[PDB]
Paper text:
Each active site has capacity to coordinate at least two metal ions, which are essential for proteolytic activity.
After failing to obtain high-resolution X-ray data of full length Pv-M17, we identified a unique 21 amino acid insertion rich in Gly and Ser (Gly = 42.8%, Ser = 33%) within the postulated N-terminal region. In Pv-M17Δ125-151, we observed a sulfate ion in the position of the carbonate.
Author numbering:
A (entry chain C): 74 to 124, 152 to 266, 273 to 375, 382 to 619
B (entry chain D): 74 to 124, 152 to 266, 272 to 375, 383 to 619
C (entry chain E): 74 to 124, 152 to 156, 161 to 169, 172 to 228, 230 to 267, 271 to 375, 382 to 619
D (entry chain A): 74 to 124, 152 to 267, 272 to 375, 382 to 619
The structure:
């Protein structure tokens, strides 16, 4: 591991990462709701019900089953997110916990409803210490949405304690009709959960823990754990490659720039893919400092969410090991700071493809690092290039906090991203690259400016800028500035890991 | 002729409207580029050419035709928007004006390129006083886009002089293009579509002291008489009987009574559509006054642009008179002012459908008027309800100034709007109604709030609020807040007229 | 049309004005410091000295030759009590004036303030010894400012003749030359005091109706012709710009037009003053930090200065000059009836104006006043008005700016500024900015698209309503109100009077 | 000291400068409009005409001359900036390019109109492949404005491509036809020199701050002094500390580039006035800890905070080339960079100027006047007759005089009127603004002798001039504030404002 520079001896030198979660010690069984009815012998028994629908399945325990047949759920409505739990004596006179969780109207369940049900369920788990949990699915739910339910359940259940100064559930039974049609999703849920969990752990780490050096060290360790080729480019080689845009952003930082390049090569029993993640470990804005009201400087540790989503996907692909596919996981990591050595508003810098860029705003630094990453990616000779980045805060005013935005130059590639959004249940919406705004990026002296003089549609403008660094490879750009961080829950979502993994696997 | 209330005798009482334009005195002829070559007789001959392509057409005048054969256009390269013009003597010793206008690379022309070509060409006309103009189309262009070129040409050519304190225009226009017979059907359509846009732009550009709820409803009456449409203007008392509490609350603070415009077209019996346009003749914001930097209060005469596009569509439909269709043109017209009688932030109002609304912001008044208009429209028993409105300024940060956004509850109707966008060449993009934001509209005391507490995706939120007033009819919503007013040119676009007209005619 | 409309019975119906001041009960005499020496006697004796220069009657003329601690610096002061031939009494004071022969309007304002501070903290007989060389015009200015700082405005206090000086003696070398400036000071002081009283009057007291009634009262006191134009006459005159501004006010517009005609033994002048009794900003409301909405009663300072000069001219009554005192008075408020941002209005000369900002209303009223003044067939048109807050960032709070279309008229304003000692600085009308006032639909916009030089833009707008008459424009937005003292200066009265009397 | 420090190897180490323009390859001739009438034999012919005035000059080609006697102005008004182009066969039946250009009403042309006419014609030169051009002046212009026309023509004709990644066809022959041509022939060489001096200053200003830093800028001055043979003296930090320039040195504390004080000296041949020209030279102004973060602070354009230094160096080129007699000129600039760092000076620091006066730093973004203070002290120690400083000092200028007229302050009426006279003959507009003594107390400090800003007076341009006057004791001194006029916001380029103004001021003394 490369040594992390420190100011005082108390500065941390590694990112604490939990490579083991309570889910690793969890048994998970899918059982037919009728032919393998829940015994209700210990722990928690949760019924997932639709609005104004009564319980229809049975439990093998006579006492509990007789209570259910009374059909008295008090004021439980089945309304989405509502909950009602209580303890009751079994046939062995042990007290088990029964619970109803509402799922909304029947046949209208989407990722939204799934997340609300999983959250309400985890609220009861955090308020208890059961060893066995039984979930009775009295709802119609597709296989991929069933897997997503388990992924989100685990996401809400496992808390992050790495930065606090201060016996979980061991068996999980899932009771649903046609159980055999869902068993193939269980161990996929394990992988997708941890990849998302890994990404969130990197995003939540504060910037004094997660810096360009420690984050690159973590990618080196990751590549060894899931058996990937690993290459970390240092400043000297970056200078040789003429990555002027990427190197200029890091000038003001005490941490040297680190360009992560991991490669997965599957068994030959064809397609080559480049995944690029924005990796700004902390974005102060530069001399265009984030000082305006609402600029959320205290949350800018999450400007490497794109890089985390790529590394989380690297875990998933490195674990699943698909055949006949080659994937490169890339991220130009650095830190955007204020210093005597920082690059200034108005500076003109040269990208690795020779194009000159006038820096109209140093807080638009992400696209500068992506420009050199895109040029690097196209030089690899891949069939598709996909980048994911917390780019434009204007995403909060367009799609908002639930739906990410995808831009691209190839309709076929865009449709693959939308498909993976459906099977991963990470919502994405297609937005246009409007050529009429291109002229607002013109510069009097440089080839381009990195920000627009006239156009307020920042997300569309930023996509136009990035497009200038792809010559003729199918390319797509996913802006997760609005969806990466959950402002209400004050935690990351790990958004993008499952989306990118589905894109690689279906290809 | 309802009397317009005045404060001083100098206050105007009508909207000046030009029912006759120079296009009504212009001859338009489409001629084959080779079999009816341009004679270079008099006036202006403009060659529309692509990048790095030589002139291939011919003129019947031998002096000029010999000049063209030399193939020296100096430094004109064909780049989009560029132009070169000069005067040269023909076979009769008369000085003719020749010109080249660049249309960009070949086979890449869209509504964007066409608008730029038409603008560069009109620059030459406004710098001249020719009686005859000949446009030589050396480009590949589809019929609908060819019609659009003419519509926009006239749009840039005819200037608005109604408010200047201060015959002289072209009389013959010849269009030389290959396979000319396929384009002749478009001319009369261009004449009607142009004036529909021209008419809408005149209502929008009229200042609010001229265009108030009374004078604009008077104009709608006159329009209905000139194109034979059924007309009905609902007054305050009838609106009170219909319990339009939301619409009426917005107008409480104005010296002009509310006026609900209802025009109806019914074609020969040889589908039923409701078109709703937002009609705030001036939006001061109310007690949530538009005082923040960048709120553009001086331009808020444009908050009736939706009403203008509906009336412009009414002219087009009332003139073309299609068969087998019935269209209702609706607009709840009012004015949002500050007064002792104004409704306050925090007031709870009741809509015509019984739902109570807490007014979290008086500057979110358009959706309140549309709410009662949607209830009114659904009572008519129509097959499609489409509204168009300058709703949310957030559109400037999402799609920007070129593309309008469309929301809806019915994918088949949304796709009909998208299809109408392609054949009208008024760009529109489909944006989602994200149900996760609906709870952001909940009110502690009323059924709904009119603005969100948490979500900043203002355009999505507004669409969720409007949806609460559509019970069971296919409905679509077009947000033209970003595209209606051309900020750089300081004039309106008349956006929506041709989009909505194409919608009615196609089915 | 002459009674002030009221919302409640307690709303005031007229402006309280003090037509008599303690200065009218004060006897003033100029004595030669050498010939008729100062007779010490009993009372206050004030010494006006320069820096590092020492003083040069009863007992203390040998007290004439001690003061130490007092250096003579500008504003410094002392005190002492004396023997006398008779004996046992007085006060005697030193007050500095800074280095010798470096006295301008600034130094004398501060000297007069220090002397008034002595009087405010204390007699009936006062003597001021002028051991300084100041010319006759600045000598009158010292007495004008002394009275200005001495008379307090108590019209709006709730608390309730014997409190003031009654005899003032001024000892100065060659005193025969200054004797003529005494009565001119009395006239000039009250003209400035009168203007200040109107400006300080709150907007609920001073409104378009009560201000026009005050003009009616003033004209009666100096026999000036007075004509007040009402809405109906303004409509037939087509003053659409001026009437648009007042649409949202509960007070009807009132156009003041006084006329003075001297005895013929020639020159015709038109003086225009901006008269917005309160400027809320309209729908372009003054809500940003720094907009000073609580002080916008001073947006009729120009009208106040014009009426104050009407008093002086109506009192001095110079020969061979005809003067017209004009002010389109109104109130800029927010209401269902107010004109909106973006409205297009028609001025009385036919030009259409797009209202890019309802807080630029002053120039709309002046536009119709200028057209009105030019139709009177005069030789010079001078307007004074609190137009642009940019003046605070240009010349500041001490110097006013003057623009115009005629160099000779401008230099006459500049020379009047020198003899009136109201500082003014000449600023340019830069024609390159004219294009920024173009409107896509109207002939003109009232504000600029791109140019931030806002005081220059405003003058370009005003110029559009003068066809072919010498015209000058004085922007007093920065100098009218004394922000640290929280009172008006009455700026412009003496400047305009000097311009009229010198002709 | 001369090495440019770099953070990465890709950081530039020199300011690219075009020392050769297409104007250097263009032949220019002035011919009498009557005794040497244009032949209209080849190339492009442009007539400069006033509104509603017919063509009055003739031309040798009888076909073209016949075309001229016939109107052919059916849509040409002569309105300012309008034009009309023709292709016409001459006596030899070859097509000739001929164009009309409107200059507005007669006898009303100022620098404003001439700037628009020059722009209109650059369009025709760009849209024409003719490399021989003849301009016929059918308008009344004095010598100085005629020179200004050529200067601005060149300014708009040449483009700055030093920072484009892409990539010389220009006009080669220019004939100027005007009445009484003999009186205008001397303006040609002057316009050539005045143009490049303006062009050179605009190149230094347009250079981004990572190219133009205190080191590379002083090195450019060294190179300029060699090319034009001037004495060059660059004072480094150690000598600056010896001279006790605490104000100037405090501003650059937070920069990675060391302070560089440029001192160029011209001494004309003896056949004896001494002038000192000081330019503000902040290569980048972030504002310091008083960071430029407020809306409209234009932090992305603050590479132009050395526009004064550029105008002085551009003047040095002109004086070094023209080489007037019996004049000694000093070209000074205290160059530095105002940055945020652990080493920067803080708001509220008290620093000591080289004349002993202590200064409380009420705002670190008012650093320009602090560097000028030590530069003014240095300048008066030279014992000169006039001191003139030029600086992008107060953003308030944009609200007072605006984008077209600069402001001049000073302590000497005679020098101020010389600056105003230079403004008329250089056609760089300037307006005289007052130093109002009543605001002086607003600069007093409870602890220091002075504050660098006022907290009560908002007339910041006047206040700044009052501050600078505290560092001139007994020498005629003028101060030219070009913050509003230096940068053309609509065109997005510098003007090189001040070069010709200062050169005219030196030459006519
Ligand atoms: Zn950023
Ligand atoms: Zn960032
Ligand atoms: Zn609104
Ligand atoms: Zn609205
Ligand atoms: Zn105002
Ligand atoms: Zn005002
Ligand atoms: Zn600064
Ligand atoms: Zn500066």
């Amino acid at each position: 591991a490369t040594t992390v520079p420190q100011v005082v001896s108390l500065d941390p030198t590694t990112i604490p990462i939990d490579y083991h979660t309570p889910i690793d010690d969890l048994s998970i069984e899918v059982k037919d709701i009728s032919a393998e009815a829940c015994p209700a012998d210990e722990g928690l028994i949760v019924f997932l019900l639709n609005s104004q629908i009564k319980i229809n399945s049975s439990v093998k325990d006579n006492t509990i089953n007789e209570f259910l047949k009374e059909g008295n759920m008090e004021n439980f409505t089945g309304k989405l997110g509502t909950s009602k739990s209580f303890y009751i004596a079994n046939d062995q006179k042990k007290y088990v916990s029964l619970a109803y969780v509402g799922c909304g109207p029947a046949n209208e369940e989407t990722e939204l409803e799934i997340r609300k049900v999983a959250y309400a369920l985890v609220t009861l788990l955090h308020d208890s210490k059961h060893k066995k949990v039984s979930i009775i699915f009295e709802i119609k739910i597709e296989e991929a949405l069933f897997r997503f339910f388990l992924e989100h359940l685990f996401y809400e259940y496992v808390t992050d304690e790495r930065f606090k100064s201060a016996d979980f559930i061991k068996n999980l039974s899932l009771h649903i009709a046609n159980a055999d049609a869902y068993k193939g999703q269980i161990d996929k849920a394990r992988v997708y959960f941890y990849g998302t969990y890994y990404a969130a752990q990197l995003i939540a780490a504060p910037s004094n823990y997660c810096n360009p050096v420690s984050l690159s060290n973590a990618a080196v360790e990751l590549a060894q754990k899931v058996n990937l080729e690993c290459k970390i480019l240092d400043v000297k080689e970056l200078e040789e490659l003429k990555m002027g845009a990427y190197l200029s952003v890091g000038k003001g930082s005490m941490y040297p720039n680190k360009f992560i390049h991991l490669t997965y090569k599957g068994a030959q029993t064809k397609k080559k893919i480049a995944l690029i993640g924005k990796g700004i470990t902390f974005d102060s804005g530069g001399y265009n400092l984030k000082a305006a009201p609402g600029s959320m400087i205290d949350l800018m540790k999450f400007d490497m969410s794109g890089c985390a989503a790529v590394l989380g996907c690297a875990y998933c692909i490195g674990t699943i090991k698909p055949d006949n596919v080659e994937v490169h996981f890339l991220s130009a990591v650095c830190e955007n700071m204020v210093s005597k050595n920082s690059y200034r508003p108005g500076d003109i810098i040269t990208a690795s493809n020779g194009k000159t860029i006038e820096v109209g705003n140093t807080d638009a630094e992400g696209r500068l690092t992506l420009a050199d990453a895109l040029v690097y990616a196209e030089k690899l000779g891949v069939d598709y290039i996909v980048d994911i980045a917390t780019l434009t805060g204007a995403m909060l005013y367009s799609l908002g906090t639930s739906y990410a935005g995808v831009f691209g130059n190839n309709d076929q590639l865009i449709n693959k991203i939308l498909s993976s959004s459906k099977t991963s249940n990470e919502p994405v919406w297609w937005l246009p690259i409007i050529n009429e705004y291109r002229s607002s990026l013109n510069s009097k002296y440089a080839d381009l400016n990195n920000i627009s003089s006239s156009v307020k549609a920042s997300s569309v403008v930023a996509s136009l800028f990035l497009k200038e660094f792809i010559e003729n490879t199918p390319w797509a750009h996913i802006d997760i500035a609005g969806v990466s961080w959950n402002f209400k829950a004050r935690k990351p979502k790990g958004f993008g890991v499952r989306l990118l993994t589905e894109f690689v696997l279906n290809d």
